[PDB]
Amino acid sequence: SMSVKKPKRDDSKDLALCSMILTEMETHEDAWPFLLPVNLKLVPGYKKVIKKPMDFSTIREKLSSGQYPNLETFALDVRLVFDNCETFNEDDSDIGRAGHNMRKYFEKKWTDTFKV
Ligand SMILES: CCC(=O)c1c[nH]c(C(=O)OC)c1
């Protein structure tokens, strides 16, 4: 509270570390469904069903332009990518599978990078 400061983790490397994780995401072989925004004019349903579209290139742009206040807002957008994917795709589809795989890949890198 006021004048009662909690000790707080060093956050000076967060931007660089998030960029690094995002690069590992981008270069994963199952990243292809998520590299670019879904084409809202070629994909039926998507615009109406998915209220907040998100993809790696949009995350990269936001990261590169200081639009994440902290690492948690970054993780929220990354998870949003995979939550959208689950909403729109069958688990037993290539894209569905890819989403699960990439989510797992992210969360381990997240834990290993920041959870001490
Ligand atoms: C034609 C199908 C298609 O373009 C598509 C289906 N699901 C998705 C998607 O969820 O991208 C992440 C794209």
Give the separation between CA 37 and CA 53, rounded to whole angstroms: 7
* Dist CA 24 CA 20 (whole Å): 6
Q: Are 101 and 30 in contact (CB under 8 A)?
A: yes
Question: What one-character-per-residue DSSP string does 7-58 give?
Answer: P----TTHHHHHHHHHHHHHHSGGGGGGSS---TTTSTTHHHH-SS---HHH
CA separation for the pair 112, 116 (Å, rounded): 7
Pocket lining: 98 vs ligand 1, CB cutoff 6 Å: no
DSSP 3-state of 63: helix
**Total residues belonging to the chain:** 116
Q: Give the distance (Å) from ligand 1 centre to CA of residue 5.
A: 46
Domain tally, the chain: 1
Domain enclosing residue 13, as ranges = 1-116
Of the chain, the end-to-end C-alpha distance in Å amounts to 25
Q: How was this structure determined?
A: X-ray
The token pair that represents 44 in the structure block: 């039926």
Extract the tokens encoding 93.
């589809």
Query: Resolution (in Å) of the shown entry?
Result: 1.9
- Which CATH number goes with the domain that contains 114? 1.20.920.10
Question: Cα separation of 24 and 48, whole Å?
Answer: 31
| Ligand 1 pocket check for 34: Cβ under 6 Å | yes
Is the Cβ atom of 82 under 6 angstroms away from ligand 1?
A: no
Query: Tokens 């990243």 identify what position?
Result: 31
